[PDB]
Ligand binder design. Structure first.
Ligand SMILES: NC(=O)C1=CN([C@@H]2O[C@H](COP(=O)(O)OP(=O)(O)OC[C@H]3O[C@@H](n4cnc5c(N)ncnc54)[C@H](OP(=O)(O)O)[C@@H]3O)[C@@H](O)[C@H]2O)C=CC1
Ligand SMILES: NC(=O)C1=CN([C@@H]2O[C@H](COP(=O)(O)OP(=O)(O)OC[C@H]3O[C@@H](n4cnc5c(N)ncnc54)[C@H](OP(=O)(O)O)[C@@H]3O)[C@@H](O)[C@H]2O)C=CC1
Ligand SMILES: C#CCN(Cc1ccc2[nH]c(N)nc(=O)c2c1)c1ccc(C(=O)N[C@@H](CCC(=O)O)C(=O)O)cc1
Ligand SMILES: C#CCN(Cc1ccc2[nH]c(N)nc(=O)c2c1)c1ccc(C(=O)N[C@@H](CCC(=O)O)C(=O)O)cc1
Ligand SMILES: Nc1nc(=O)c2nc(CNc3ccc(C(=O)N[C@@H](CCC(=O)O)C(=O)O)cc3)cnc2[nH]1
Ligand SMILES: Nc1nc(=O)c2nc(CNc3ccc(C(=O)N[C@@H](CCC(=O)O)C(=O)O)cc3)cnc2[nH]1
Ligand SMILES: O=c1ccn([C@H]2C[C@H](O)[C@@H](COP(=O)(O)O)O2)c(=O)[nH]1
Ligand SMILES: O=c1ccn([C@H]2C[C@H](O)[C@@H](COP(=O)(O)O)O2)c(=O)[nH]1
Lengths: 510, 491
């Protein structure tokens, strides 16, 4: 009964020119070593590999230490390998077999009592045979999120949708996202399916008491499970309420998520997020811009329905031109408290530039505890097309020059807005880290009224049947040119290794 | 042979009076009692205790009963009743429970009880029968084998009586996954933990105790404005239920008078700290001395003037500040009034927030506000919840005070809106322990929490609007904390 261990691009690519397609992934090698070596004593595990895989390995590491090595080949002989390098004392002699079935026979015949687990370690010849024989119980797959030139591929398999969009192999384990050398990746395991404190439990018994994301996944390390579980939690436990929009709501109050920013970027994968939209909106905020036509004109229409003639009038703002969000978000960030006129006015130097203050405090006194920016100005709310939802953020620097950010959001459309908000403030954290010579560490999301609209519930349930993919990496390009927060442009960003499931249509509650 | 005692007692160990119970009917305690005693089982009770039971329940059903009188229609002693359980009933008897005094004290002297199931009634009541003193006693009030708590429930209440439940003891797919979890856990000296002997930690105060432990264990050592130094973390969260009891911390006495007076002071939009100090509430004095104000570049401020902070922003957001003797009536935005009006007319609105954070006015304040935003929420059962966001949290000194403060605001706002208080949710930014508090906090972490008290609003009929509350309209009922712990304020 065998296990497969592999690293794989989303297109199932595993090799090129008898080498690996990506730069060195040190955590993946640790993992490989740890999975293939470990045992309870008497025994060792075996690794079975094809001839070219054996040849692809550097001499100094071959044979793989403390594991019985078997090579499947018809041309290489056991004495070829013995001649390559002296067998070290205590290690096993390297065996050669003509086929995978022969390797498994040999294991039974001559190494019962001696080997514990059997691992098939590549290449495509062996992976294919192992799947054909149906002898693989588990797949240890390292999912590399970037595509690389490959000439060798892991075979198609039922359940290969954990890699990319199109007996079965279902994931029972999904880790958080790692990275090395600009490459994001994660680890999954698939499974072939087809009176101490005794007497305390009756008090527990009487004090004690449906929708769930991909419930077969038992180890839920991927940080996107916070979002997926929050959807389920609201649907299971939330309360059905009315709402400003007339569309129903199911709501909860006081919710929390947090996303690491040191290895990869929390752009959700369980549906495609509108990244051009987040980037363009954030730059617009940073400008202090209140003209949503500037967004609309670039193909970002997110503010259009709340800046129509009709919606502005429902807000008693007949004097606003279409597109004018009033003194909201970016205006309050860059010009807190300034007297608003319209979206065409120059406000340079009016009011408080909170963003500048935060940055200057980060650069000069990062232990200060007042590094906040707010968009909630009670005096100006009635002049806004919409009172801000994400209304405050706070920054923090630790010991090691690592920057974390908290954002408070009064109102959270879990279906439509939340993924977008996660990406937006995570990006702001990247931008601020760079300009302050800091390392981005963490985004922390504090949520007030956290809701899913009734007309989203069905689509959200489909979303919960999808397992997450490894997070992408976002790189800031042209770092040397970029010295201040206003220097960033729409071209200074690269999203690397993003492989989300398909878009899900969800109407905005207007 | 294993024996357990089931009891409910006041902090002074009171269990009865005039052959009855001291307190009004405790519904949940009775459930608890029912369950615990059956899973047949034997309950064993003294003569008088049998009488006290109403006849409709007198045979305690689904359990063997034993009365230990020497005068009735049934053993003559407690040793006797234990013999009668080995000899006969040896089979089909699981555990045995003793359920009066005399019986309790017999069971303790003979040393046969291995566990104590105690319902701690938080209030005192007249009693003439008391549970025996016993080592482990401090679990009730502040007054060799010993009894150690192993379980401490959340706080309940019925008929205006707060109470707790504690238990004391006499003293392939997982295989596939394993190697992967193991390496992920590897990286990565002696952790502290609040009362590690308590396994089942239902008491909501454990959030605060665990928070202290987590900061000291996993926080990073940093500098800070005051010069004292802290250990800090960022982004922490607690929540306290308000429907049964009130989260006034019990592992050290919280300064309740101070909480109440500061809050009423906020609500009036008062910015003169001498009004607090003149009432014996000196919490703001060191941040409004001549010296501190000058350090803030405020030489023109009069001693005691906090500037346009907290309450001023609540009641007059954005108004132009003069001094603390000015009348600001009608000026600025009355956020508190707006919040209340929205709660009363359209409680599904998602903009029910109040902020103290006004960037245009920060430099004019003695201290930028720590608790700077709160948001309210109503469900479909008319239950009110409140979230407060705090940018900077002095865990040892400030946090217990802040918890009580906003929980109290929640009770007040619920009342004038004809809602019921449900939950206070505490969101924390820079969450820190000052270096000179660490030792004191380590003492505190050795204390088992007591049941939370309940706070009642008095004269409810007179109180219609948030401004109507006075310092005399509240009663804290059943508060039984451990002693105060001195913690010096970093200025
Ligand atoms: N990303 C990853 O996880 C991994 C990537 N790689 C790499 O993948 C590509 C190399 O693998 P691949 O090209 O498939 O090389 P293989 O390791 O499969 O070696 C190829 C050959 O191995 C022996 N052979 C294999 N299958 C059979 C069979 N089914 N029956 C009989 N003999 C068999 C044969 O050698 P003979 O001709 O002597 O008979 C066949 O020619 C490389 O890039 C290697 O580095 C490898 C392992 C893992
Ligand atoms: N808070 C709680 O959890 C509980 C409180 N209570 C309160 O109990 C009061 C009664 O307790 P208490 O007055 O101590 O009543 P008991 O139930 O202990 O009855 C007293 C007597 O019981 C039999 N007895 C007890 N001890 C001995 C002994 N050591 N040797 C021989 N016989 C013994 C005797 O009756 P005889 O004279 O016939 O020999 C002794 O006089 C009430 O207020 C009752 O409600 C009771 C249960 C629980
Ligand atoms: C949060 C936030 C910012 N916002 C601003 C914004 C404004 C009003 C709102 N109103 C409501 N009820 N919910 C929102 O989330 C919301 C968000 C967004 C608005 C729309 C989309 C959106 O429609 N996303 C879709 C469809 C459009 C597209 O892709 O072009 C998507 O699936 O990407 C995203 C973000
Ligand atoms: C929260 C809040 C409101 N506040 C306001 C307030 C002002 C400045 C602060 N400064 C610091 N560093 N931490 C605080 O918690 C703090 C709190 C409080 C202030 C003091 C006490 C208090 O109990 N002080 C102690 C110790 C005085 C001393 O000797 O230093 C006392 O003796 O009671 C409580 C609440
Ligand atoms: N997930 C996965 N990642 C891989 O890199 C991988 N590689 C191969 C084949 N190629 C190689 C090449 C070198 C070493 C190697 O030197 N291994 C050392 C790593 C030691 C360590 O980091 O502790 C070993 O002793 O395992 C292993 C396999 C087969 N399955 C894989 N599977
Ligand atoms: N913790 C504790 N609380 C008590 O009230 C208590 N009471 C007694 C003695 N008095 C009483 C009185 C009535 C019932 C009683 O009627 N018990 C029923 C019903 C419980 C219910 O009404 O839900 C039972 O079988 O549990 C039990 C004990 C002994 N130990 C106690 N221990
Ligand atoms: O950044 C944003 C902006 C808006 N929304 C959705 C929040 C709500 O479901 C609706 C906003 O309307 P009110 O909360 O103002 O009713 O905003 C978000 O989730 N994120
Ligand atoms: O309600 C309050 C007021 C103050 N503090 C303590 C917060 C800090 O440790 C110190 C305030 O100083 P700065 O955060 O402003 O530096 O305030 C609180 O914990 N709660």
């Amino acid at each position: 009964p065998v296990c497969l261990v592999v690293a794989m691009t989303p297109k199932r690519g595993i090799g090129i020119n008898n080498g690996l397609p990506w730069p060195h992934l040190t955590t993946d090698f640790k993992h490989f070593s740890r999975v293939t070596k470990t045992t309870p004593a008497s025994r060792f595990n075996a690794v079975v590999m094809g001839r070219k895989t054996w040849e692809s390995m550097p001499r100094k590491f071959r044979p793989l230490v403390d594991r019985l090595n078997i090579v499947v080949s018809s041309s290489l002989k056991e004495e070829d390998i013995a001649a390559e390098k002296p067998q070290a004392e205590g290690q096993q002699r390297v065996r050669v077999c003509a086929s995978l079935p022969a390797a498994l026979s040999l294991l039974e015949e001559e190494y019962k009592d001696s080997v514990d687990q059997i691992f098939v370690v590549g290449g495509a010849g062996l992976y294919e045979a192992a799947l054909s024989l149906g002898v693989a119980s588990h797949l240890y797959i390292t999912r590399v999120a970037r595509e690389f030139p490959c000439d060798v591929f892991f075979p198609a398999f039922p359940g290969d949708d954990i890699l990319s969009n199109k007996a079965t192999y279902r994931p029972i384990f999904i880790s958080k996202t790692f990275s090395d050398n600009g490459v994001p990746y994660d680890f999954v395991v698939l499974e072939k399916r087809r009176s101490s404190a005794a007497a305390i439990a009756p008090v527990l018994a009487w004090m004690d008491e449906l929708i769930r994301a991909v419930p077969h996944v038992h180890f839920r390390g991927h940080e996107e499970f916070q979002y997926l579980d929050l959807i389920a939690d609201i649907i299971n436990n939330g309360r059905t309420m009315d709402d400003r929009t007339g569309v129903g709501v199911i709501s909860k109050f006081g919710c929390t998520m947090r996303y690491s920013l040191d290895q990869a970027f929390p752009l959700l994968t369980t549906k495609r997020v509108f990244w051009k939209g987040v980037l363009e909106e954030l730059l617009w905020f940073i400008r202090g811009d209140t003209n949503a036509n500037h967004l609309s004109e670039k193909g970002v229409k997110i503010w259009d329905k709340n800046v129509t003639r009709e919606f502005l009038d429902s807000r008693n703002l007949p004097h606003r031109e279409v597109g004018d969000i009033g003194p909201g978000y970016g205006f309050q960030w860059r010009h807190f408290g300034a007297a608003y006129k319209d979206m065409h006015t120059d406000y340079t130097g009016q009011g408080v530039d909170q963003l500048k203050n935060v940055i200057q405090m980060l650069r000069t006194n990062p232990t200060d505890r007042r590094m906040l920016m707010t968009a909630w100005n009670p005096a100006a709310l009635d002049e806004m097309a919409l009172p801000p939802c994400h209304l405050l953020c706070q920054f923090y620097v630790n010991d090691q020059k690592e920057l974390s950010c908290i954002m408070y959001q009064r109102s959270c459309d879990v279906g439509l807005g939340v993924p977008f908000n996660i990406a937006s403030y995570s990006l702001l954290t990247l931008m601020v880290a760079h300009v302050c010579n800091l390392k981005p560490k963490e985004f922390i999301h504090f949520m007030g009224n956290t809701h899913v609209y009734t007309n989203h519930v069905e689509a959200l349930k489909e979303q919960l049947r999808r397992e997450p993919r490894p997070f992408p990496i976002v790189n800031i390009l042209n770092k040397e040119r970029i010295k201040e927060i206003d220097d960033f442009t729409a071209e200074d960003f690269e999203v690397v290794g993003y492989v989300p499931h398909g878009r899900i249509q969800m109407e905005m509650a207007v």
